[PDB]
Amino acid sequence: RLVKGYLEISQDGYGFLTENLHNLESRVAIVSAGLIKQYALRAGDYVVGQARPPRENERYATLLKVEAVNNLDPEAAKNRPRFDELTPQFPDRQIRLETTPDELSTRVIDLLAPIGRGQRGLIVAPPKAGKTTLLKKIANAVLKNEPDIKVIVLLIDERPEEVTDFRESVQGAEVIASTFDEPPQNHIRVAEFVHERAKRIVEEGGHVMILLDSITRLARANNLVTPPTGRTLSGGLDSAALYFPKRFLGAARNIRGGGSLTILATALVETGSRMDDVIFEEFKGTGNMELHLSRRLEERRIFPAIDILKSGTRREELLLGEEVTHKMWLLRKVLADMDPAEAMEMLLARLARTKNNKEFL
Amino acid sequence: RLVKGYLEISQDGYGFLTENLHNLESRVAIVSAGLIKQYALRAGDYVVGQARPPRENERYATLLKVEAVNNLDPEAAKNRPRFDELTPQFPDRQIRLETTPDELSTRVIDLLAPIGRGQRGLIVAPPKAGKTTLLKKIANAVLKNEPDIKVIVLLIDERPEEVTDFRESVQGAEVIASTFDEPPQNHIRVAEFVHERAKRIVEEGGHVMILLDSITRLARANNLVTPPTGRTLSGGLDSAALYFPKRFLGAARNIRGGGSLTILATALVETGSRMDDVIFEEFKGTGNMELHLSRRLEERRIFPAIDILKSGTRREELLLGEEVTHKMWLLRKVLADMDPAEAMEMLLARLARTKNNKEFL
Amino acid sequence: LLDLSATELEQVLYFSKYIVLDPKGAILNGVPVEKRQLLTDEEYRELRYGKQETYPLPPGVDALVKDGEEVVKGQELAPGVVSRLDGVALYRFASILVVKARVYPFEDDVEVSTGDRVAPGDVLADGGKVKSDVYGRVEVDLVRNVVRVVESYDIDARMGAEAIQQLLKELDLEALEKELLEEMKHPSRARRAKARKRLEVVRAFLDSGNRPEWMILEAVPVLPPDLRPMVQVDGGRFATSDLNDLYRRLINRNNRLKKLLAQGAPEIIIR
Numbered sequence: 001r002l003v004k005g006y007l008e009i010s011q012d013g014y015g016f017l018t019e020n021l022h023n024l025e026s027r028v029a030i031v032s033a034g035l036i037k038q039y040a041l042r043a044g045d046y047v048v049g050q051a052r053p054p055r056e057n058e059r060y061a062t063l064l065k066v067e068a069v070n071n072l073d074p075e076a077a078k079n080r081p082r083f084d085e086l087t088p089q090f091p092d093r094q095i096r097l098e099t100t101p102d103e104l105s106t107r108v109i110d111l112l113a114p115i116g117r118g119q120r121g122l123i124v125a126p127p128k129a130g131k132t133t134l135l136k137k138i139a140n141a142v143l144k145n146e147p148d149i150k151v152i153v154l155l156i157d158e159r160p161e162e163v164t165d166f167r168e169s170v171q172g173a174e175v176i177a178s179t180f181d182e183p184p185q186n187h188i189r190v191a192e193f194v195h196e197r198a199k200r201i202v203e204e205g206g207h208v209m210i211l212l213d214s215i216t217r218l219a220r221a222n223n224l225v226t227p228p229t230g231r232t233l234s235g236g237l238d239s240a241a242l243y244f245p246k247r248f249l250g251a252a253r254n255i256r257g258g259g260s261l262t263i264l265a266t267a268l269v270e271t272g273s274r275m276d277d278v279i280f281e282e283f284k285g286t287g288n289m290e291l292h293l294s295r296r297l298e299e300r301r302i303f304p305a306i307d308i309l310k311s312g313t314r315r316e317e318l319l320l321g322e323e324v325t326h327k328m329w330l331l332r333k334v335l336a337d338m339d340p341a342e343a344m345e346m347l348l349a350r351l352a353r354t355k356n357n358k359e360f361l
Numbered sequence: 362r363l364v365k366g367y368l369e370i371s372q373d374g375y376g377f378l379t380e381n382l383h384n385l386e387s388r389v390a391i392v393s394a395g396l397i398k399q400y401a402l403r404a405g406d407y408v409v410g411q412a413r414p415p416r417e418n419e420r421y422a423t424l425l426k427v428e429a430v431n432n433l434d435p436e437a438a439k440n441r442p443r444f445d446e447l448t449p450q451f452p453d454r455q456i457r458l459e460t461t462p463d464e465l466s467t468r469v470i471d472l473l474a475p476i477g478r479g480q481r482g483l484i485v486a487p488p489k490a491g492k493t494t495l496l497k498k499i500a501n502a503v504l505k506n507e508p509d510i511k512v513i514v515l516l517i518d519e520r521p522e523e524v525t526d527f528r529e530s531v532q533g534a535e536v537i538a539s540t541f542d543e544p545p546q547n548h549i550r551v552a553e554f555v556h557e558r559a560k561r562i563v564e565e566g567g568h569v570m571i572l573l574d575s576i577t578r579l580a581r582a583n584n585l586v587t588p589p590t591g592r593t594l595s596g597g598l599d600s601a602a603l604y605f606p607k608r609f610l611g612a613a614r615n616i617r618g619g620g621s622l623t624i625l626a627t628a629l630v631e632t633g634s635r636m637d638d639v640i641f642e643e644f645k646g647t648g649n650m651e652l653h654l655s656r657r658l659e660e661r662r663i664f665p666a667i668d669i670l671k672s673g674t675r676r677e678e679l680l681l682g683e684e685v686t687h688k689m690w691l692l693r694k695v696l697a698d699m700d701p702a703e704a705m706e707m708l709l710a711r712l713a714r715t716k717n718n719k720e721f722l
Numbered sequence: 723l724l725d726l727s728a729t730e731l732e733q734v735l736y737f738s739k740y741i742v743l744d745p746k747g748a749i750l751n752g753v754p755v756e757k758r759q760l761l762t763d764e765e766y767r768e769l770r771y772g773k774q775e776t777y778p779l780p781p782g783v784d785a786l787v788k789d790g791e792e793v794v795k796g797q798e799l800a801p802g803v804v805s806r807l808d809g810v811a812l813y814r815f816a817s818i819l820v821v822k823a824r825v826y827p828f829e830d831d832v833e834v835s836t837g838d839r840v841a842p843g844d845v846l847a848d849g850g851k852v853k854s855d856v857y858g859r860v861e862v863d864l865v866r867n868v869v870r871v872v873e874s875y876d877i878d879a880r881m882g883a884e885a886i887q888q889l890l891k892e893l894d895l896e897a898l899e900k901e902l903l904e905e906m907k908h909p910s911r912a913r914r915a916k917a918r919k920r921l922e923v924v925r926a927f928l929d930s931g932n933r934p935e936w937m938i939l940e941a942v943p944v945l946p947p948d949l950r951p952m953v954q955v956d957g958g959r960f961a962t963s964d965l966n967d968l969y970r971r972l973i974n975r976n977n978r979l980k981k982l983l984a985q986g987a988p989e990i991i992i993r
């Protein structure tokens with residue numbers, strides 16, 4: 001009998017193999033602390049192997065033997081560089097975006113904010129501004145442009161119908177979701193579980209792509225979870241709650257030893273609540289990309305409703321050639337002075353005619 | 362067998378010799394309180410001496426003998442004026458700034474904010490405003506203009522890539538860094554260790570610079586660490602947390618008995634939090650150098666994005682000659698009326714032509 | 723049970739510090755190797771390294787000894803300094819230390835390492851030509867290119883309740899019982915009376931089953947909560963059964979112990 005799951009080590013030194021729901025389940029497979037010690041297994045590690053039905057007085061199946069960890073033979077787990085020990089650098093491997101149903105969005109992103117491997121990015125938009133649809137477009141574009149990259153879609157505290165739509169529209173990439181019907185605790189628990197899985201995969205030199213809707217809602221859950229910290233930050237945020245989300249986001253990085261962790265998440269702003277704005281400003285100093293969407297552009301029904309001037313990456317030179325760098329510089333110089341909505345209109349009209357590279361010519 | 366390090370005196374009267382990582386390390390060397398008493402030695406003092414392998418039941422090697430303290434014979438350690446007893450005065454000796462890859466940045470610094478030895482300085486800019494790049498330029502220009510001075514770079518709560526880029530771009534100068542992945546305790550510990558080392562060096566009449574990226578993040582760690590203090594300052598700042606950064610920055614001074622500590626640090630403003638602004642205005646009264654960078658100038662890609670009008674020193678006369686003082690006074694008079702971006706574009710045009718002395722000519 | 727000074731030496735080692743190990747303190751101390759007696763670590767140190775007797779040399783005053791010169795107990799290491807025990811007097815930059823040891827100059831590679839304790843015949847240096855014919859620790863001083871075998875041969879150390887519980891576990895009872903049977907049935911009352919006095923507890927343990935290996939305390943259970951009640955008297959004052967008043971202190975005790983064992987080993991402090 002074979003079982004599989006993702007390793008979750010308990011405080012007691014033994015662990016369990018989890019399902020896709022990312023929570024304790026009846027059919028989780030017990031993993032003795034021993035196996036963990038011999039194989040140097042770590043939280044989030046994907047474990048597959050033969051198991052046996054639990055003996056009398058046992059409530060969960062026990063892993064008789066381990067076969068493969070993270071889809072590879074266990075021996076390499078004993079000797080491997082730890083994720084924390086991996087050198088963080090810039091993403092030196094740009095990812096071109098193109099999605100058939102709306103490639104305007106992909107080309108505008110490429111002309112506004114290029115993508116690399118190991119990316120620490122963020123999209124910032126008020127409610128109802130294409131942030132969710134934009135994330136869907138990026139997901140579809142990546143699942144057409146970088147199939148090699150493990151695409152995990154994480155949806156925290158968001159609309160269930162959107163979860164169903166993305167699950168159906170993600171063509172099989174791991175969609176992990178925890179709607180707003182869940183308490184903050186479920187959100188956070190799924191958070192560390194997915195995150196550790198990703199870091200364990202990257203430990204093996206893999207490229208992992210994370211598309212996280214509602215990073216701000218995750219920060220809200222962390223704040224609801226921080227037990228006191230004592231004082232409260234400006235706006236009603238907790239001083240120490242944001243440490244965890246910061247660590248989550250800063251985990252994204254490029255590795256000179258192979259593999260990368262690229263996290264792109266959705267941020268909410270102009271909500272009239274100081275929590276959101278403080279969270280955004282806090283995350284901006286940690287992320288390498290901001291991409292801004294304007295509520296007024298959405299009001300006029302112009303998509304993608306991107307605020308071009310505020311949007312951009314850092315170290316575009318490392319993701320684009322000299323020609324593309326100077327072209328984007330020219331395009332921003334031309335567009336720098338224009339009003340948001342009308343600038344986006346001219347950009348769409350100019351990109352609607354043809355593809356971006358031939359738009360250059 | 363010889364060992365070396367910087368002294369960390371424990372509460373118990375004995376100390377340990379540390380490595381560049383500025384943390385308890387397995388290779389640290391034990392130092393008996395007795396030795397400390399003979400050599401009147403102090404924390405942060407650099408100690409070199411022959412050591413022996415630890416005996417049975419000893420976890421750390423023991424310094425059999427002290428050979429050199431702070432690169433000199435231990436005798437002077439017994440007889441020497443004490444750092445806190447050193448007379449604090451103005452920087453009375455200029456440091457000219459010139460760096461080949463960007464002479465314009467050091468140029469505008471010299472024409473706006475010239476640097477003496479013992480300088481208590483600050484550069485104030487929003488995120489993404491040439492602040493860190495500017496600090497890199499100052500580091501390189503120091504390493505070309507003042508190679509004799511012990512150049513120390515400190516990076517707190519900042520971005521790993523910046524760390525590595527400075528390791529390669531500092532050309533071997535002692536840099537101590539602690540990215541944002543580390544907790545504030547690590548930051549505070551490392552900062553105080555380097556602080557004390559620097560004070561010990563200046564105790565011997567030495568010249569030092571601390572290039573401290575993110576002094577505001579260091580203040581953030583101080584706030585997070587201060588246990589209560591009771592009342593909280595407006596903006597989310599703790600009252601007694603800032604005492605430590607205030608002392609820390611105030612350490613920079615000119616010494617009439619030789620040597621001096623200069624500290625140039627990077628400040629964040631216009632970040633949307635009262636906390637950053639309160640820190641800025643609080644440090645501004647202790648520092649003698651404010652150099653302002655404008656976000657709008659960066660948006661136009663005009664560099665260095667310096668806000669000329671807000672920038673300046675205090676007691677230029679002690680650091681500049683009458684001709685240079687009147688040159689810069691004429692310049693500022695011309696320049697008060699112009700707008701930030703226009704002033705910088707025009708200044709870059711005028712300075713791109715010739716050396717600054719030839720610019721005056 | 724442990725044939726001990728049950729009253730004095732017991733607490734003497736439990737609270738004051740005394741080295742004890744059974745295997746071999748083979749090297750002499752005025753009396754030959756001791757087997758299970760406890761010692762003060764001062765003499766165990768002096769033994770540890772032969773006999774180093776260091777005496778300062780007045781400034782500008784040259785010593786009357788050589789660096790690798792044999793100096794006997796009582797010899798003047800300098801015009802005013804007088805040695806107190808034999809060995810080789812070695813120079814210090816400044817002083818002279820006569821370490822009780824036998825000297826073996828080497829002109830070839832050294833064969834013993836300073837620290838190793840070598841038996842008579844064991845090679846010290848230069849291969850089989852420089853050999854140690856003395857038990858004890860070795861100091862290979864290239865200062866004059868000699869290997870000095872101090873008489874200090876391998877004698878280790880132990881202390882406190884850990885050694886206590888070790889000896890506990892280090893004892894098999896039926897051996898003691900047979901010996902005590904001999905000590906009563908043959909000998910006279912003066913000694914056999916106490917022999918049986920201990921044999922009685924020996925019988926208790928042996929026939930009882932359970933080992934005394936847990937005779938001492940290492941995992942102290944913690945009273946159920948209400949059992950030592952904390953009752954709210956009024957207005958905020960608390961009336962607590964004194965057990966907690968001691969539990970708290972115990973916790974603090976153990977906590978700082980953990981801290982210092984993680985932080986550093988100030989042996990006086992640790993004890």
Ligand SMILES: Nc1ncnc2c1ncn2[C@@H]1O[C@H](COP(=O)(O)OP(=O)(O)O)[C@@H](O)[C@H]1O
Pocket residue numbers: 125126127128129130131132133134303304
């Ligand atoms: N590119 C687009 N094309 C058509 N409709 C869009 C687009 N972007 C946003 N919308 C509209 O905006 C609404 C919500 O935007 P979306 O990003 O999906 O969620 P959010 O409310 O988080 O922004 C949707 O009902 C959708 O009709």
Ligand SMILES: Nc1ncnc2c1ncn2[C@@H]1O[C@H](COP(=O)(O)OP(=O)(O)O)[C@@H](O)[C@H]1O
Pocket residue numbers: 314315486487488489490491492493494495659664665666
């Ligand atoms: N003098 C300059 N030349 C070229 N680029 C610059 C210059 N100053 C700033 N930049 C741009 O600003 C970005 C980051 O600015 P930085 O100084 O790190 O932020 P901050 O000023 O807030 O510390 C870099 O990606 C860089 O391209």
Ligand code: BEF
Pocket residue numbers: 126127128129132268
């Ligand atoms: F309107 Be969005 F879903 F915040």
Ligand code: BEF
Pocket residue numbers: 285487488489490492493
């Ligand atoms: F480099 Be900036 F402080 F974002």
Ligand SMILES: [Mg+2]
Pocket residue numbers: 128131132
């Ligand atoms: Mg939405």
Ligand SMILES: [Mg+2]
Pocket residue numbers: 488489492493
């Ligand atoms: Mg910066």
